[PDB]
Structures are given as C-alpha cells and as structure tokens.
Amino acid sequence: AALEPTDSGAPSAIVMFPVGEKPNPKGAAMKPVVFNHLIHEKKIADCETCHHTGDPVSCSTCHTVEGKAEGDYITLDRAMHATDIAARAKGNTPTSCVSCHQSETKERRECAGCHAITTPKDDEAWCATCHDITPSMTPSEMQKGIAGTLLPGDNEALAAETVLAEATVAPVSPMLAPYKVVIDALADKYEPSDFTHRRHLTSLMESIKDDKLAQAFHDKPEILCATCHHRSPLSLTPPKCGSCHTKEIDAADPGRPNLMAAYHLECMGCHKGMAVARPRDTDCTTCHKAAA
Amino acid sequence: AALEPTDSGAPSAIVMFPVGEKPNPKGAAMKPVVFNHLIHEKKIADCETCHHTGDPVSCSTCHTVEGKAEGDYITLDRAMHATDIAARAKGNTPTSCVSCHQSETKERRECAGCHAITTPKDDEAWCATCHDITPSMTPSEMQKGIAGTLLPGDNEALAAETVLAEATVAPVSPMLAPYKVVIDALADKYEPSDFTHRRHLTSLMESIKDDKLAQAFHDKPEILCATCHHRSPLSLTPPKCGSCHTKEIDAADPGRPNLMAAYHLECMGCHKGMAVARPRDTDCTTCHKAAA
Ligand code: HEM
Ligand code: HEM
Ligand code: HEM
Ligand code: HEM
Ligand code: HEM
Ligand code: HEM
Ligand code: HEM
Ligand code: HEM
Ligand code: HEM
Ligand code: HEM
Ligand code: HEM
Ligand code: HEM
Ligand code: HEM
Ligand code: HEM
C-alpha cells in the first residue's frame, strides 16, 4: 500500500499548501496540490531544473503567498503558474509547474500539432488537475499545512490517499465520431476534401495514449474533439465550422477567419505544428482534387 | 402537457432549430433553443423590438445558418448572439438574444453594480442556458426542425416538455459566507476596512430574487460569489485577493492591478455602477477610518 519510495529521498507524493505568514484561519485558499515527486523525478533528470537555487527544499520556503526576500518577493502564485519566464543571462532560469508543462506541448512533436491550434482553456477543470486534494483533509489539517506544523506522517497519508484515488479520464473512442467527412461547403475550384476524420483522431490519440501529463489534463472524455471543434460545448455532434465561420468577409467578427481560411489555417496549422510531411501547405490537390 | 397560452397568439414556447439549406443529416449543431415567448412578451412591450422587420415570422426565414440576401446575409449565429449592434438611424435597430440580455445587466440599477465588475464568462453553462432542449427530442425530429417540416404541434410538445422540466439553481445563502470581514491585508495609513460582507450579498440578492433572466444565467449555487471572488473555482472558501494581487505593480503581469487598486476598483466599481450615494469614491474614511 505504501507509495513507491523515490531514489532521491524526496517524499514520493507531497501535499503543497498555501504557505504564508498572514493569518488565514478560515482557509481562504485553493485546494492544496498533491505533487507526485516520484513520477516527476523519473522523467526530469536534473534536480536543479526545478530546484533552481540548488537547494533541495520546499519552494514555499522562499515563495510564500505574500512574497519574502528569500524569494526576491516572487510569490507562490507566480512561482507555480508563471507563463512568461525571462531567460537568465547567468545561471539557472527557473521553471513553474505551468511553464514546464506548456513547454512539453510545444516541443514534443506528438503534442505540438494539436497544441499549435488548440483554443486554450484555463477553467476550473484545468485548475483542479493540480488543485486536487483528498476530501478527507480537515480544516484543522489545512491549518497545519499553512502553518508548517502538519506532521510529515499526515502529509504522507493525505498525499497517498489522494494519489491512490486519482483516476485517468478515458478519451471517447474515435469510433463514436465520423469515419470520414466529405467537406464540400465551399466546393467550386476543387472537389470536396474527403477528410479522414477517424484516421486522424486515431493516429493523434495513439501517439499520446500513455502520456501521463496529457492524460491528467485531457480530463473530459470528449476533450480532444475541441482541438478542432472549438468554442462550443463538448459534444458528439458539434456545430459545423460554417455555422460560425461565414464564407465571405465578416467585419463584425474581425477575429474569425472566413470559412476557407478557417479550414486552411486549422488543417495546415497542425500539419506544420507536428511537421507532417504530406500534404505540404503548397500541395493544393492532396486535400481536394482539382475540379473538372 | 401544454403551457399558458399567450396574449399575442405566438406559441407559448417555441423550439428554434439551426435552419439552413445545406444538408445536415447527422444534426451537427448546438442543441436547439426553447424560447419562452410567454415570459418574453409579458416583459417586453413592443412586438417590433424583437420582430424588427415588423412581421412576426421566424428569424430564420431570413437569418439562415449560412446567411442569405433577405437577412442582408446576417447569419443565424450573428442574429442570435450579436453583441455590438449598430444603432439604425432608419427604423428599428435589431436586437439579439445576447444583446438585449446584456442591456438588461447594464441599464437596470439592481443588475448594474455587480455587472460593472463581473468577469464575463461565456462557458458551456452559459450556452446551455439557451441551448436547452429536452433529451426526448429524437434525431428524426431534429431533422424535421432543421428542414422546417416539424409539425407545429410537435414543436409545441417538445417546447412544453422542455419548459416543464426546467430547473432553477438556488444561490447559496449568505449565511454560509462571512458575516463581516476585517480587510487588513494592507493596513497602514488607515485602519482595516470592516466590510459588511453578508449585508452586501444579502442586499444584492434581495433585489434580484424574482428576476427570471438573472435566475436562468446565475446557474451555479455559488456563482454570485464569483462577482468578487473571480478567476478561481466556485468555493465557499476562495483564495484571498492578495494571493493573486501583489502589493506593488508586478512588471511580470502589468495589467493585473496591485492589491490596493484591486479593492478600490472592485468596491468603487460596483458602487458607481449601481449609483450608490455613499460612500463616494472620495469618502475614503467611510470605508477605512484614518489610523490613529
Ligand atoms: C486555474 C486557473 C488555477 C487557479 C485559479 C490557481 C490559483 C492558485 C492560487 C491562488 C494559489 C496560491 C495559494 C492559494 O490557495 O491562495 C495557487 C497555488 C498553487 N498552484 Fe494553482 N491555480 C490554478 C492552476 C493550477 C495548475 C493547473 C497547477 C499545476 C500545474 C497549479 C499548481 C499550484 C501549486 C503547486 C500551488 C502551491 C500549493 C498551494 O498553495 O495550493 N495551479 N494556485
Ligand atoms: C533530483 C533527483 C531531485 C531531488 C534530490 C529533489 C529533492 C527534493 C526534496 C528533498 C524535497 C522535499 C523538500 C522539503 O523541504 O520538503 C522536494 C520537494 C519538491 N520537489 Fe524535488 N527533487 C528533485 C527533483 C525535482 C524535480 C525534477 C522537480 C520538478 C519537476 C522537483 C520539484 C519539487 C517540488 C514541486 C517539491 C515540493 C515542495 C513543497 O512545497 O512541498 N523536484 N524535492
Ligand atoms: C521549487 C521547486 C521552486 C519553484 C517551482 C520556483 C519557481 C520560481 C520561478 C518560476 C521563478 C521566476 C519568476 C519570474 O517571474 O521570473 C523563481 C525565481 C526565484 N526563486 Fe524560485 N522556485 C523554487 C524554489 C526556490 C527556492 C527554495 C528559493 C529560495 C532559496 C527560491 C528563490 C527564488 C528567487 C531568489 C528567484 C529569482 C531568481 C532570478 O534569477 O530572478 N526559489 N522561482
Ligand atoms: C503530448 C503528449 C501532449 C501533452 C503533454 C499535452 C498536454 C496538455 C495540457 C497540459 C493541457 C492543458 C492546457 C495547458 O496547455 O496547460 C492540454 C489541453 C488540451 N490538449 Fe493536450 N497534450 C498533448 C497532446 C494533445 C493532442 C495530440 C491533442 C489533439 C488531439 C491535444 C489537445 C488538447 C486540447 C483539446 C486540450 C484542451 C484545450 C487547451 O487548453 O489547450 N493535446 N494538453
Ligand atoms: C472527438 C471525438 C470528435 C467528435 C465527436 C467529432 C464529431 C464530428 C461530427 C459529428 C462531424 C460532422 C460530420 C457531418 O457533417 O455529418 C465532424 C466534422 C468534422 N470534424 Fe470532427 N469530431 C471530433 C474530433 C475532431 C478533430 C480532433 C478534428 C481535427 C483534427 C475534427 C475535424 C473535423 C472537421 C474539419 C469536420 C468538418 C466540419 C465542417 O466542415 O463543418 N474533428 N466531427
Ligand atoms: C470547424 C471544425 C472549425 C474550424 C476549421 C475553425 C477554424 C478556426 C480558425 C483557424 C480560427 C483562428 C485561430 C483560432 O483558433 O483562434 C478560428 C477562430 C474562431 N472560431 Fe473557429 N473553427 C471551427 C469551428 C468554429 C465554431 C463552430 C465556432 C462557433 C461556435 C467557432 C468560432 C470561432 C471564433 C469565435 C473564433 C475567433 C477567436 C478570436 O480570435 O476572436 N469556430 N476558427
Ligand atoms: C494550395 C496552396 C491550395 C489551394 C490553392 C487551395 C484552395 C482552396 C479553395 C479555392 C478552396 C475553396 C473551395 C473550392 O473548391 O473552391 C479550398 C477549400 C478547402 N481547402 Fe484548400 N487549398 C490549398 C491547399 C490546401 C491544403 C494543403 C489542405 C489540406 C490540409 C486544404 C484543405 C481545404 C479544405 C478542407 C477546404 C474546404 C473544401 C470545401 O468546403 O469544398 N487546402 N481550398
Ligand atoms: C455559448 C458560447 C454558445 C455557443 C457556442 C452558441 C453557438 C450557436 C451556434 C453555432 C448556433 C447556430 C446553429 C448551430 O447549431 O450550428 C446557435 C444558434 C442559436 N443560439 Fe447559440 N450559442 C451559445 C450561446 C447562446 C445563448 C446564451 C443564447 C441565448 C441567449 C443562444 C441562443 C441561440 C439561438 C436562439 C439560436 C438559434 C436556434 C438554434 O439554431 O439552435 N446561444 N448558437
Ligand atoms: C407582440 C405582442 C408580439 C407578437 C404579435 C409576436 C408574434 C409571434 C409569432 C406569431 C411567432 C411565431 C412565428 C412563426 O412563424 O413561427 C413569434 C415567434 C417569435 N417571437 Fe414573437 N411576438 C411578439 C413579441 C416578441 C418579443 C418582444 C420578442 C423578443 C423578446 C419576440 C421574439 C420571438 C422569437 C425569438 C420567436 C421565435 C422565432 C423562431 O425563429 O422560431 N416576440 N412571435
Ligand atoms: C433569443 C431567441 C432569446 C433567447 C434564446 C432568450 C432566452 C432567455 C432565457 C433562457 C431567459 C430566462 C427565462 C426563460 O426561460 O424564458 C430569458 C429571460 C428574459 N429575456 Fe430573453 N431571450 C431571447 C431574447 C431576448 C430579447 C431579444 C430580449 C429583450 C428585447 C430579452 C429579454 C429578456 C427578459 C427581460 C427576460 C426576463 C423576463 C422576466 O420575467 O423577468 N430576451 N431569456
Ligand atoms: C439583474 C436583475 C441582473 C440580471 C438581468 C443579470 C443577468 C445575468 C446574465 C444574463 C448573466 C450571464 C452572462 C451574460 O452577461 O450574458 C449573468 C452572469 C452573472 N451575474 Fe448577473 N444579473 C443580474 C444581477 C446580478 C447581481 C446583482 C450580481 C451580483 C450579486 C450578478 C452576478 C453575476 C455573476 C458573477 C455572473 C457570472 C459571470 C458573468 O458572466 O458575468 N448578477 N447575469
Ligand atoms: C479616498 C480617496 C481614498 C483613499 C486616499 C484611500 C487610500 C487607501 C490606502 C492608502 C489603502 C491601503 C491601506 C492603508 O491602510 O494604507 C487603501 C486600502 C483599501 N481601500 Fe481605500 N482609499 C480611498 C477610498 C476608498 C473607498 C471609498 C473605499 C470603499 C468603497 C475603500 C476601500 C479600500 C479597501 C477595502 C482597502 C484595503 C484595506 C486594507 O487592506 O487595509 N477605499 N485605501
Ligand atoms: C458567496 C456566497 C461568497 C462566498 C462563499 C464568499 C466567502 C468569503 C470568504 C470565506 C472570505 C474570507 C474571509 C476571512 O478571511 O475572514 C471572503 C472575503 C471577502 N469577500 Fe467574499 N464571499 C462571497 C461573496 C462575496 C461578494 C459577492 C463579494 C463582493 C461584493 C465579496 C467580497 C469579499 C472580499 C472583498 C473579501 C476580502 C478578501 C481579502 O481581503 O483577501 N464576497 N469571502
Ligand atoms: C469592497 C470591499 C467594498 C467596500 C469596502 C464597500 C463598503 C461599503 C460601505 C462602507 C457602504 C455603506 C454602508 C454599508 O456597509 O452598507 C456600502 C454600501 C453599498 N455597497 Fe459596498 N463596498 C464594497 C464593495 C461593494 C460591491 C463590490 C458592491 C456591488 C456588487 C457593493 C454595493 C453596495 C451597495 C448596493 C451599497 C448600498 C447599501 C445597500 O443597499 O445594500 N459594495 N459599501
């Protein structure tokens, strides 16, 4: 039942609390975050990538909710979520939880296709992927974590309970969505684009099927459908692109591409993102045969 | 079952479908919208405010999904959700669903205080407030609604079943939130501000307790807490403002107010929005007495 021990001597899993000096008797705070150090140290080889100062200590020893000189007044909020971290001319460039994860999406070919075109969503389910404590923690325990007085045994117990109770959401099967879609809304100079809908989603899914970071944040069964079917409720029958993207110019919606450009930008955007060899963006017949 | 017949003669409630010419055999679309004509016409005096062309005919006779000349190519999506509609110098300026509802939040003092400072949120739960059809509608009926061959009695039956299954979420009691809060995060030149938390919420809630539009859209029990406790999961114990808002301007987040401006902008923002006589924004000591 015990969690697997780390090689490092860090706790296998640890509950991270909103550490600060301002009294917070009512526990006004996000849910604490249980961090799975085991999983992370197996994947990220350099301890100092994260522990950027070289010190094997809790980030909140320096980055408290309100900020303290040891962390150059960089707060807990900033240290955990910062998306725009400047490269340090000298020494280590720190990482945040959010910044490293986002990097994975851009630098790994299997992730960078979809993540070239996704409509970012940082909603409650996004926060909850990390702000994820077991319901068994009491207010009193929340207070001891804030105060640094929780005993390491209780931190372990809460952490283990939480990790043991996590479950990975399974993405809906590509069989529940079209096998192909004959995109013919605009057909004129070319024949329809016979989009291999199932072939596409199956392939994209297969390359990430065991990735623990994707599995944790792809956390609704239909969520991958939003990669293309964006800005509408998750659904097995989403609205057509052309319900929101007009064929002609739409100056009342300056940010929305017209329908041809919508297909081109989205289809070619992923192809570029994940370096798809064929079709190239300059290939004007592989996606749609020339009309008679 | 059947609904209350209207004075106008329109069906008491009407299912609105994604009407257009292009085949949609799989019903790729949002859920149809059940519009409560009865409730609307009892509140809105002039038929022409909505039926801007003067004749009470379905909007999608002119505003199809793809658009067409009889609607000046303004699509069904633009006609229902348009937010930035130009005032017409000749005749009736059209309204959309969204635009009139937004006007309500702005032009009515009981709505305009919170709505001067809320963090706008057009998420799935917002969409579903209107895209709200009974689960009993079958794909075949959806096809007939799209094609305009659904029998009027069938439309009626679907709308009545939908309306009669509607649920209003009750907002949590202000007794579940603090009576008063000593706001002392920044205490220095002034004493802490002893904010009348419960009196504020209770008062704001009292004034909208019977409003059907607010009731539909305020659709999570803790949603009203988000008026002030924004950008975090709905919670009875949200994070402190100062967990995200730093004491001094952070150059890393230069559009995020610092903590003092966070309080001032929020507190004075609603006060201005709903024409609160006192405190004026210059009545400093009213919100925080000078420090002895
Ligand atoms: C989602 C948008 C989200 C929000 C909101 C959020 C807020 C936030 C706050 C305000 C803090 C500071 C402490 C407090 O409770 O006031 C906090 C701290 C941590 N966060 Fe967070 N956070 C959200 C998103 C996420 C995501 C997606 C992750 C993981 C990648 C994450 C991580 C952390 C960690 C770690 C902490 C410190 C521990 C704690 O104080 O709970 N956050 N977050
Ligand atoms: C490399 C193998 C490595 C070491 C060693 C290490 C140590 C370490 C310790 C001793 C702790 C506990 C500190 C405390 O005083 O409680 C700890 C905690 C955290 N670590 Fe770590 N760690 C190593 C690797 C990494 C890597 C690669 C990551 C980033 C992906 C990382 C992150 C963290 C975090 C976050 C914590 C929790 C701090 C808290 O607030 O509880 N570690 N680490
Ligand atoms: C714990 C593993 C930990 C995290 C995570 C963390 C993150 C972090 C961020 C993202 C920054 C950069 C912020 C920016 O806006 O540029 C940052 C910067 C500093 N930190 Fe840190 N940090 C972690 C832990 C610790 C430790 C334990 C301390 C104190 C010993 C600390 C200190 C600092 C300071 C100082 C800086 C500034 C460095 C710079 O080059 O500006 N961090 N941290
Ligand atoms: C590749 C293994 C991969 C990673 C890693 C990954 C991570 C990831 C995160 C962390 C999120 C949350 C939002 C954020 O950027 O922090 C996220 C969200 C979505 N992803 Fe993803 N993802 C990877 C791969 C893929 C693939 C192959 C697809 C397309 C099929 C995909 C799409 C999605 C979508 C949709 C979301 C939600 C919207 C968003 O916030 O981007 N991801 N992913
Ligand atoms: C995720 C599993 C998902 C589902 C569900 C889904 C459904 C869906 C339907 C029902 C159609 C309509 C077909 C018709 O007109 O009869 C459709 C059409 C398109 N899809 Fe899709 N789809 C899902 C996933 C994805 C993904 C991840 C992408 C992009 C890689 C994608 C793309 C498209 C496109 C393009 C179309 C055509 C829409 C149009 O031309 O209006 N879908 N999908
Ligand atoms: C159908 C699968 C479809 C495609 C294709 C499509 C593409 C598309 C692109 C390339 C953009 C620009 C980049 C981006 O994602 O921001 C874009 C922009 C918006 N879309 Fe779209 N879109 C598809 C479907 C839909 C649907 C069904 C809607 C309406 C519910 C919708 C709406 C929007 C909007 C809004 C934006 C603009 C965002 C902004 O920058 O202001 N799209 N889409
Ligand atoms: C090569 C650069 C290229 C050209 C040229 C091109 C043109 C084009 C037109 C004019 C349309 C409108 C429909 C018509 O038949 O006139 C059209 C629409 C689609 N395209 Fe395209 N297109 C070029 C390249 C690409 C590539 C590489 C892709 C696939 C990644 C692609 C896809 C699409 C799709 C989908 C549509 C919609 C088809 C329809 O609605 O009939 N195009 N393109
Ligand atoms: C929430 C952001 C939301 C989305 C997304 C959205 C989309 C949408 C589309 C794409 C259409 C056109 C037809 C289609 O199904 O393809 C459509 C049509 C209607 N809408 Fe809508 N809609 C969203 C939000 C809302 C809300 C909050 C309202 C009510 C104020 C509303 C209303 C309607 C109406 C009425 C229609 C016409 C009937 C229909 O086609 O279902 N929408 N919407
Ligand atoms: C004023 C008292 C008034 C009249 C009269 C009126 C009539 C009416 C009819 C007869 C219908 C049905 C149309 C059809 O052919 O199916 C209808 C439908 C809608 N109405 Fe209406 N209506 C009057 C008042 C108003 C008011 C003030 C509004 C806006 C708040 C409103 C809106 C609508 C809408 C929307 C519908 C449904 C149209 C659809 O596409 O199905 N009406 N009305
Ligand atoms: C457009 C077709 C449209 C839709 C859809 C829509 C929806 C809607 C709902 C879901 C509510 C809540 C109560 C109910 O279920 O009926 C509601 C309430 C009112 N609305 Fe509305 N509404 C649409 C159109 C419009 C228009 C064009 C206006 C103003 C001209 C408007 C106004 C209002 C009013 C006011 C209310 C509350 C009525 C009350 O009894 O207090 N709506 N609407
Ligand atoms: C006054 C009677 C009033 C109305 C009307 C109203 C409407 C309303 C709607 C239509 C929404 C959905 C979002 C949109 O703008 O379309 C919405 C959302 C929220 N409201 Fe509201 N609301 C009225 C009053 C009040 C009052 C007095 C408060 C504060 C106590 C309040 C709060 C909010 C919150 C928060 C939201 C969600 C976030 C957002 O989308 O604004 N409203 N309301
Ligand atoms: C009147 C023009 C005015 C001034 C001046 C003023 C300044 C002020 C300061 C300097 C702060 C920091 C706290 C301190 O004690 O130094 C501060 C804080 C808050 N204020 Fe203020 N303020 C003025 C006006 C207003 C008004 C009219 C309100 C109420 C509507 C108000 C609100 C607040 C609150 C709340 C805070 C935080 C208090 C704390 O954390 O100690 N102020 N203000
Ligand atoms: C909705 C019912 C709601 C809840 C729940 C909520 C709770 C709450 C908490 C627990 C506190 C912390 C108090 C403490 O630390 O002693 C708190 C504090 C403040 N709130 Fe609140 N609150 C709810 C709603 C509202 C509303 C609608 C507003 C704005 C009108 C509001 C305001 C605030 C403010 C300001 C504070 C102080 C926060 C700080 O100084 O960090 N709340 N609330
Ligand atoms: C923000 C923390 C904030 C402060 C501080 C504050 C104070 C304040 C004073 C001192 C009064 C007069 C007496 C009283 O306590 O009622 C006053 C009254 C009203 N306020 Fe206020 N106010 C703060 C915030 C807000 C917010 C964010 C709103 C609207 C969402 C709001 C509204 C009101 C109302 C209305 C009044 C008048 C009395 C009533 O009818 O309840 N306040 N506030």
3-state secondary structure chain A: CCCCCCCCCCCCEEEECCCCCCCCCCCCCCCCEEEEHHHHHHHCCCHHHHCCCCCCCCHHHCCCCCCCHHHCCCCHHHHHHCCCCCCCCCCCCCCCHHHHHHHHHHHCHHHHCHHHHCCCCCCHHHHHHHCCCCCCCCHHHHHHHHHCCCCHHHHHHHHHHHHHHCCCCCCCCHHHCCCCEEECCCCCCECCEEECHHHHHHHHHHCCCCCHHHHHHCCCCCHHHHHCCCCCCCCCCCCCHHHHCCCCCCCCCCCCCCHHHHHHHHHHHHHHHCCCCCCCCCCCCCCCCECC
Residues of B in contact with A30 (CB under 8 A): 232-233, 239
Residues B142, B22 share a domain: yes
Contact status, residue B256 vs residue A75, Cβ threshold 8 Å: no
Residues B184, B64 share a domain: no
Question: Domain of A54: which CATH number?
Answer: 3.90.10.10
Mutate to test the pocket of ligand 13, among B110, B181, B193, B259 (most ligand atoms within 8 A of CB): B181
Residues A145, A108 share a domain: no
Residue-number span of the structural domain to which A181 is assigned: 100-129+168-292
Q: What's the CA gap between B17 and A237, in Å, rounded?
A: 14
Rg (CA), chain B: 23
Q: What's the CA gap between B271 and B204, in Å, rounded?
A: 12
Whether A66 sits inside 8 A of B30 (CB atoms) is no
Q: Is the CB of B57 under 6 A from ligand 9?
A: yes
Rounded to the nearest 5 percent, the helix, strand and coil shares of chain B are: 40, 5, 55
Q: Which of A66, A64, A30 is nearest to B229 (CA)?
A: A30
Q: Which of B178, B220, B246 is nearest to A124 (CA)?
A: B220
DSSP element (H, E) containing B195? strand B193-195
Number of folded domains that form chain A? 2
Q: Is B40 annotated among the ligand-binding residues?
A: yes
Q: Which atom of ligand 5 is nearest to the CA of A174?
A: 2
Shortest-distance Cα residue to atom 32 of ligand 6: A244
Q: Which atom of ligand 6 is nearest to the CA of A119?
A: 15
- The residue from B108, B141, B167 where one domain ends is B167
Q: What's the CA gap between A100 and A118, in Å, rounded?
A: 18
Tally of residues, chain A: 292
Residues A142, A7 share a domain: yes
Residues A108, A90 share a domain: no
Residues A189, A149 share a domain: no
Tokens of A85: 């971290």
Residues A156, A91 share a domain: yes
- The residue from A167, A194, A223 where one domain ends is A167
A36: phi then psi, degrees, rounded to nearest 5: -95, 90
Name the resolution in angstroms: 1.8
DSSP element (H, E) containing B35? strand B33-36
Experimental method: X-ray
Q: What's the CA gap between B13 and B39, in Å, rounded?
A: 9
Mutate to test the pocket of ligand 11, among B115, B119, B198 (most ligand atoms within 8 A of CB): B115
Q: What's the CA gap between B106 and A232, in Å, rounded?
A: 26
List residues near ligand 12 (CB under 6 A).
B 183-190, 192-193, 260, 263-264, 267-268, 271, 279, 281-284, 287-288
Residues B134, B6 share a domain: yes
Whether B128 sits inside 8 A of A234 (CB atoms) is no
Residue of B nearest to A125 (CA): B233
Residues B203, B259 share a domain: yes
Residues of A in contact with B244 (CB under 8 A): 77
**Signed CA dihedral, A203, A204, A205, A208: sign only:** positive
Q: What's the CA gap between A17 and A60, in Å, rounded?
A: 9
Residues of B in contact with A234 (CB under 8 A): 124
Q: Which of B179, B184, B177 is nearest to B260 (CA)?
A: B184
Whether B30 sits inside 8 A of A239 (CB atoms) is yes
Q: What's the CA gap between A253 and A250, in Å, rounded?
A: 6
Q: What separation in Å is there between the alpha carbon of A78 and the centre of ligand 4?
A: 22
The answer to whether the peptide bond before residue B279 is cis (omega within 30 degrees of 0) is yes
- In sequence order, the β-bridge partners of residue B290 are B190
